[PDB]
Structure formats: structure tokens, C-alpha cells
């Protein structure tokens, strides 16, 4: 299975919800998917 399009840059595909999810929600918490970690590490 594949989506017609793709999640936007600052998003990630959450497999449990089967949905694009903004990476700002997982930044911090220790269990972060890495495609977030540029954005998430680029924080302060």
C-alpha cells in the first residue's frame, strides 16, 4: 500500500494511526522516529 502523495517535510507517517503526523508532537519524549529528529533537534 502507498498513498497518492506523501507526508510534508516536517511530518512523518505514523503507522499506528496510519496518518501523516507533525513531528513537533514527538520531539523530546524518548521514543522519537528519526525523520523528525532533524526538525526536533533543530529546536531549542
Amino acid at each position, epitope marked *: *500500500l*502507498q498513498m*497518492a502523495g506523501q507526508c510534508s517535510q516536517n511530518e512523518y507517517f505514523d503507522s499506528l494511526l*496510519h*496518518a501523516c503526523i507533525p513531528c513537533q508532537l514527538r520531539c523530546s519524549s524518548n521514543t522519537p522516529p528519526l525523520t523528525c529528529q532533524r526538525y526536533c533537534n533543530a529546536s531549542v
Partner: nanobody
Amino acid sequence: QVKLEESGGGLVQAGRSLRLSCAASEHTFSSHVMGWFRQAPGKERESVAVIGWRDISTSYADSVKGRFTISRDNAKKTLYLQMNSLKPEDTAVYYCAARRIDAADFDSWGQGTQVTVSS
């Protein structure tokens, strides 16, 4: 778990359309990921289409891409599979399935409905 009831299957000729429906015993829009699967004689069950939390993401099998559409009416508590450009290889028993957004596997299943496509 939520109960599912399917309908809409039948015997059609190639190129025609068919709409399958799956009524749920409760709301799923923000609680359940939904899917249409299909199994042909002697074949394994394959995933056809999946719609995720709050209908943010839909995914389709490549063989059905552009021809099928999975959708959901939350008021009618009903999942739909719109099947256009039906081909003989679409002949199968079609199931709807649901799983809580915090569960990895589909644990709710409808009884299935037969779809046959002749030429």
C-alpha cells in the same frame, strides 16, 4: 470490538462499477483505522485499501490504484469502497476490517461479500 456488516457485492461485467458498504456498530472516524481486503480462490488475503485516523491518509494497492476509492461517512457510520473499471482479476471475496488506532492488527472483520467480474 466494533462489529462490521458488509453489502454491495455481486456479479458484474468487466468495466462496470460497484460500491461496497460496511456498516459499523460505532463511530470510527477518530478511533479506528479501517481497511478493505480481498481473497480470491486459492489465493491469500491481500489488503486493497486503508483509511487512517480522521481520514488524513488513504493508501491503495497498486493493482487497484486510480480505480478504487475507500471513503468513510461518520454520520452514517459506514465505510465505502467504490470500484470503477472492474477487471476479472478483481474477482474475490471482499472484507472490511477495523482496528483501534493503538492496535497493530485488524481484529474486527465483516462476513465478506462476493464480487465476480466476467467478460
